[PDB]
Amino acid sequence: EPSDVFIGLKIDQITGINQKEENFSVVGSLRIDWRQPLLAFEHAPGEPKHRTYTLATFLKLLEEKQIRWPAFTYHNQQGRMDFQNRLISLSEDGTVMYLERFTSTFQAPAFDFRLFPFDNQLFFIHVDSIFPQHLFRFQEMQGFSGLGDQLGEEEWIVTEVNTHLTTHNEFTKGDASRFVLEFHAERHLNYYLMRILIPVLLIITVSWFTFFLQDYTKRIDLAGGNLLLFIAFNFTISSDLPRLGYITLMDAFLVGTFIITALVVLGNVWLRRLENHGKQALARKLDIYAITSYPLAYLLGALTLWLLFF
Amino acid sequence: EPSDVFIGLKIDQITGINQKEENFSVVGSLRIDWRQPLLAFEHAPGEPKHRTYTLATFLKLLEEKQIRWPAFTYHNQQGRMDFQNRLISLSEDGTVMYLERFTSTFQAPAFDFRLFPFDNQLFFIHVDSIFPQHLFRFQEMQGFSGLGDQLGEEEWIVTEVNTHLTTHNEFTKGDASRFVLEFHAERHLNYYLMRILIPVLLIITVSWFTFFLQDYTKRIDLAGGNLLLFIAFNFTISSDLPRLGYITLMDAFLVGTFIITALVVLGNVWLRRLENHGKQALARKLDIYAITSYPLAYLLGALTLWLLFF
Amino acid sequence: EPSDVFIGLKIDQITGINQKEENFSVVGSLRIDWRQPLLAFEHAPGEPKHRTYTLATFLKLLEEKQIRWPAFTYHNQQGRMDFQNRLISLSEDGTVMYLERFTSTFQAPAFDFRLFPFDNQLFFIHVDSIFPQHLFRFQEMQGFSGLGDQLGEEEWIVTEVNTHLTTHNEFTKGDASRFVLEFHAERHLNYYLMRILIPVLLIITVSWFTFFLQDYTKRIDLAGGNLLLFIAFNFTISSDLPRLGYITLMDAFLVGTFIITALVVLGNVWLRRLENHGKQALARKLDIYAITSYPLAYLLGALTLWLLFF
Amino acid sequence: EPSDVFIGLKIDQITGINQKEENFSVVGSLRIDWRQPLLAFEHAPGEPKHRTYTLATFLKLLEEKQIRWPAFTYHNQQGRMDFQNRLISLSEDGTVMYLERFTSTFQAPAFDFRLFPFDNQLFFIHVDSIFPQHLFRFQEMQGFSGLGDQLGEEEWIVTEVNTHLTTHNEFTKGDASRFVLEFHAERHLNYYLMRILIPVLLIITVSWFTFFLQDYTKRIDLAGGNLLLFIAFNFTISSDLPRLGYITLMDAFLVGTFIITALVVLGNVWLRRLENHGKQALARKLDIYAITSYPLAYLLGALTLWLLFF
Amino acid sequence: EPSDVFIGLKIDQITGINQKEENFSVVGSLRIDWRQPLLAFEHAPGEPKHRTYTLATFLKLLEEKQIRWPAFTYHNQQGRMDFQNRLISLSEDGTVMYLERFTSTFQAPAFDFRLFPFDNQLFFIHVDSIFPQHLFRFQEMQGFSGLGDQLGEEEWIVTEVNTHLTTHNEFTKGDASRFVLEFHAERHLNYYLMRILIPVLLIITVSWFTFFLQDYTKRIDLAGGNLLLFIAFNFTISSDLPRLGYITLMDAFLVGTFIITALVVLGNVWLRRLENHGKQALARKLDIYAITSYPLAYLLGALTLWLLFF
Ligand SMILES: CCCCCCCCCO[C@@H]1O[C@H](CO)[C@@H](O)[C@H](O)[C@H]1O
Ligand SMILES: CCCCCCCCCO[C@@H]1O[C@H](CO)[C@@H](O)[C@H](O)[C@H]1O
Ligand SMILES: CCCCCCCCCO[C@@H]1O[C@H](CO)[C@@H](O)[C@H](O)[C@H]1O
Numbered sequence A, B, C, D, E: 001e002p003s004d005v006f007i008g009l010k011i012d013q014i015t016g017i018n019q020k021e022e023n024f025s026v027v028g029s030l031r032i033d034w035r036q037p038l039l040a041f042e043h044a045p046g047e048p049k050h051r052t053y054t055l056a057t058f059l060k061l062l063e064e065k066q067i068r069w070p071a072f073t074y075h076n077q078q079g080r081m082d083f084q085n086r087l088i089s090l091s092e093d094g095t096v097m098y099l100e101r102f103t104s105t106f107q108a109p110a111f112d113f114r115l116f117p118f119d120n121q122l123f124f125i126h127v128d129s130i131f132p133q134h135l136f137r138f139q140e141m142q143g144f145s146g147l148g149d150q151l152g153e154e155e156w157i158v159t160e161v162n163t164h165l166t167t168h169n170e171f172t173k174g175d176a177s178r179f180v181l182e183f184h185a186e187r188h189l190n191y192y193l194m195r196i197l198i199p200v201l202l203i204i205t206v207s208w209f210t211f212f213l214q215d216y217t218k219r220i221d222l223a224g225g226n227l228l229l230f231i232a233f234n235f236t237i238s239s240d241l242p243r244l245g246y247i248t249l250m251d252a253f254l255v256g257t258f259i260i261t262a263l264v265v266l267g268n269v270w271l272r273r274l275e276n277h278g279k280q281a282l283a284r285k286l287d288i289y290a291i292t293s294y295p296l297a298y299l300l301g302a303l304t305l306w307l308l309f310f
């Protein structure tokens, strides 16, 4: 008969989501109800019926009694877990009540930048029983597991949280319990609008104004400068993200501007070629194309992407 | 009858307030008076009436006597708390005197950048009893809890400190004590004046001087360069702050300049268009507008913000 | 007669490969089966036949019985190893079952940047018995040692994993066991294409378009600007890597552009020299060379490297 | 009768002085002579008369004997103190000899940037007795406390060290001992000369040379470029320092250049205005002012500061 | 009679040499043979003749027997030392065999940047006996102390390693043992050639080509731009190094270029002054100087340094 273990995991804080290293960090409380008959005791009245134990001596106790604790790992933990509380309460009955507060970092291998910055993502913590389900079953501690209401995370905003149980075969080849706390968040795009999109559109629009000057040299010098500008924005954006082998939506948008800008140069080179060759008045005829290919090439662009990537 | 616990928390240092990660860090002393009748002892004369204990053995003592300690957590702690002292003194009476010095980082989810850089903010530490108020009540240790007077924090300057008690329901569903040390600080704006405001005004004013040259090409080249300048200041400022989904006052000020600057380009494009079209003397007439739209567009700006955001 | 130790090492995560410091970091589980008859006990009917031990007390047990544990080191460990689990299970038989989960960083002195960014690399962890092979032999725990399938590492992609045994003479001058987990990964070049190659080609190609303007001044000013651009890319790339004493393929590609660009200047200086000397129409004759030396000098370049370094 | 405690604190290394966070870091040894009669023991002749103890068991000893240790804190410690040695030697007499080696970071709230980079500063470590001077008095361990002669700190250079005693009232309201190790260092200005002063003077002087070209356009374009240059130097320097609410000497020097440069623009705008208005030969007359206002405005500057801030 | 202690220190890795903070970091094994007759034991046929001990219980053993351990410190250790192994083996004879693996950072106050980047440097670790040479003598454990051949450090390359013994007077005023592991390394200059020297020479050489255009304006604009370029390289290089009060060879090389570049401006200003004054054909005569002062001023420079600093 497998004895049941009641796994609660609440997340008081999201300290931060480092999307470049594909992890997130949380202040969290873990809560475990586990009844061991064998840990039951009897108290004379005037001696409390609930014992309070440092995990340190609670385990040194289980080791004397050679009782098995339902040993667990956080499977997607990264680095150290700076514990605040590791505290046992034990009723006459032998119901163990373990609480574990901590800061730690966790793997988010659930990261899909395909649609960056528009993407929504899955963050999850895996609590695994080391021991199989013949010995210990994880059940859902009720009215606890979830996300608190002072997470302090400004870029992301959490759509929904789910709790569920399932199995693994990590160290055992017997099926073992895995309690899972999943949450999706999606990205507050203000930052991106404000720092990336708005500037780029300013640069593109102001750039276009200088077309009404009808100086093709000054257009080419301008468009050439824009190129480096975008190539910069290319490095601003690259450094938010990993060295992905896959192509972001952002990546398209930029290479988009690159292509246009290069052809703005090439086009105005050829308009300027015609002034150089005594066809000034023809270049002036063709000019109206050049002037209304700018906004259309960049709006043809807005639907090359918004279709291809939506 | 719940036995009372006397919670003092002093802050010797503000090591720093990291506003990008929305936390702060402090060197702090915690002080607890808690009388346990059962911890009372009797001393032969020539043996001190005050026992001095490593927390390590003080808890191993409480575990022998199966006495409950008023276990607490720092609810808004982030990461590890590098303790210096964890020291118990115990009178014949059984009055426990716990002292806990530490450096730690703390969540400041109280962060309102709406008015950055002019904002004032709330920093607070939450000390929670794990156990309900049926067992332990937190009371305010008098003549201790507050902030020291070499905090060493130069950007912020602390308006006031408040201490008060209240409840939580973190692990228990019984009401539990929470001792709170709140402080407000506000921001020394020297840095912002010196590095952001002064430059931007210089750039804007000097820029304007070159209008009296009456070269519309040279105005457009100039205003176009200012744009990138501001777009830079846009990234200087962005990196002090998180990737907020909300719009700073700073954010406005910049997008403010962006809008004007773009229209400075557009306007001087059109003045220059008139020289190109044999209306040089008209463009020269209109010029006085162009020359006194600069200072007014940027002072119309000073009240677009100072109203919208005050 | 040496007692055998059964060494399993699985890698649940690659937290990251820091190629500048020539190390990598992993979440990993170590598993050891080791039968000590002397640890055998009697599994009295009704009493559990499997003892569960904190490493802490398991070693304090071996120290009472003065039994030797097969002490091991991770030979290529760097810094601290933040352990999650260090857990012993011991049958009546005296079969010790040690599990050790951890995050740690590891030396990758196997790093060959000669072909960066095209290179493939060897990452390996060395688990050494401190004690010789007269006392303890490492054997391969079967159906465990390998790499998990949520590593979360986006730039690298793992070709293959190998496990094998061998010896060392680190502290002993007697031969000692070394269990080795090797893996090769190779680099997703998207990043490099997207951020380095594409831009550089844009700069080079757009640059070339402005040749059809037939302004040698404007070519020289342009090529001079490209130089600094590349010199920048030289610092972008330098800082992904160590301060190598050996010359990358990347290093060549850049110095490649440098050489061409400098000679583009020198060539167009001399074309412009001829306009200055009343041989405008000759410079115009020679121009066709200048215009079709650009694409050929940079494609002569594409096979100076692709041969020299392949 | 208060028993005396003999406090030695030597600083083997200055690991570094982080002036932006207003702290410094040191490798240090602490040494304490403290005679407890009650810890005295009797040596049967041929048995050693000096006991050597891990602090771990030395305190577990004091806890058995319920003897009070003269518990101390480092009052201006920041974060963790990575101890190397914590070692007790105890003679027949009962003379405790505690040694404590460590790396730690310390608050330097003694930081006066008013004269940066010319400033000299106070670094100090506070060792406080937790217990009052009715129980324990701190006295100066002689021929130990000071600074070593391989600190390895290159920017600062230590003028003098002082050791002295005083009181506090941190946790007690009884007077308590505080042993203090103060040192002043002052700043090797080479760095500042080499990277800040020399460049700025070059920029200013070379800039001035181009005046002898008598092109007022080319002066205005030049002075405008200098402005951004200085605005850069403004950010180089700002980031060495905190976000001070007070105004550095450095801050003046820069805003100095800003003011001049802006008025260089304004002046040459007006010289150029006169060429635009058919008064070319007058602008040429006035020119000699413009040419010898540059060196005088920037040398009028050298005594606006060298007086105001000396 | 002082009992002898046999000190071996091997360095498996150089994790890195941080030259800006003047330290280095190493994975290392420490090995100590120390015979204590008093720890000698006798066994029945069955119990091994070599006892294996956690340092934890080995010291708790020495504390029972009140035996003195030859306590040591790493004198030039910085921060924490993340230990992997701390393992005692003890023969019947009472020969203690302590092994200590670790990562730690170490002071290199042996740092002479005078000749940067050409400099060679001394790295050393100091292992000190706390106790004098009346009690414990350090002797050299043979066939161990040295450096391994997978250090993994790419910029430096180790010339030679030395071991020797000597004394200190750190805490004692009696002479005490200090085992020293010294190594010299020198710097792979590839990085510096590739990123600093090559560019600077390109900039200087290409710059010179544009002289054959015979446009003194375009030379002055060019040389002025070079200045800022070098002033940038001045900040690249400054930040590899500390804020030394002493002047690098690098520092000279840069200030070298600064001086020349400024005088290139000044000279071409004066050539251009002569065109402005109707002496165009004279400036053209003098030009040949200007054109062959560039390569000579910068090669006169190559021996101003290579003599002054060699
Ligand atoms: C690239 C294709 C078409 C021409 C555009 C090139 C730039 C136009 C003039 O600006 C200059 O650009 C340099 C690098 O290009 C900068 O280093 C320099 O400070 C800037 O003054
Ligand atoms: C840039 C959009 C604004 C266009 C309006 C005319 C402004 C032209 C001046 O800026 C130029 O821009 C390039 C990058 O675009 C820079 O490389 C170059 O140093 C700079 O001289
Ligand atoms: C801005 C100061 C106003 C006073 C007059 C000086 C004119 C200088 C404007 O050209 C600048 O050229 C740089 C090329 O390196 C650009 O990067 C920069 O954006 C652009 O503004």
Ligand SMILES: CCCCCCCCCO[C@@H]1O[C@H](CO)[C@@H](O)[C@H](O)[C@H]1O
Binding pocket: C220, C221, C223, C224, C225, C227, C228, C265, E203, E206, E207, E210, E221, E222, E225, E226, E228, E229
């Ligand atoms: C070096 C090869 C010969 C031609 C190019 C000369 C040096 C680099 C060109 O960029 C220059 O750099 C400055 C920004 O740093 C600008 O102020 C300047 O106007 C711009 O043109």
Ligand SMILES: C[C@H](N)Cc1ccc(Br)cc1
Binding pocket: A032, A034, A055, A069, A070, A071, A072, A096, A098, C085
């Ligand atoms: C390895 C775990 N930290 C040990 C533990 C697990 C469950 C309970 Br209930 C108590 C202790």
Ligand SMILES: C[C@H](N)Cc1ccc(Br)cc1
Binding pocket: B032, B034, B055, B059, B069, B070, B071, B072, B096, B098
């Ligand atoms: C910080 C730990 N909860 C330990 C503790 C022990 C005693 C008292 Br009084 C308060 C707390």
Ligand SMILES: C[C@H](N)Cc1ccc(Br)cc1
Binding pocket: C032, C034, C055, C059, C069, C070, C071, C072, C073, C096, C098
């Ligand atoms: C050095 C290791 N941490 C100690 C140890 C090794 C092997 C086994 Br089986 C148990 C404990």
Ligand SMILES: C[C@H](N)Cc1ccc(Br)cc1
Binding pocket: B085, D032, D034, D055, D059, D069, D070, D071, D072, D096, D098
């Ligand atoms: C809190 C300190 N770690 C305890 C201590 C202080 C002084 C001496 Br002497 C020994 C121990």
Ligand SMILES: C[C@H](N)Cc1ccc(Br)cc1
Binding pocket: D084, D085, E032, E034, E055, E059, E069, E070, E071, E072, E073, E096, E098
């Ligand atoms: C500082 C060390 N913890 C003490 C030590 C040194 C040497 C030997 Br042998 C054993 C212990």
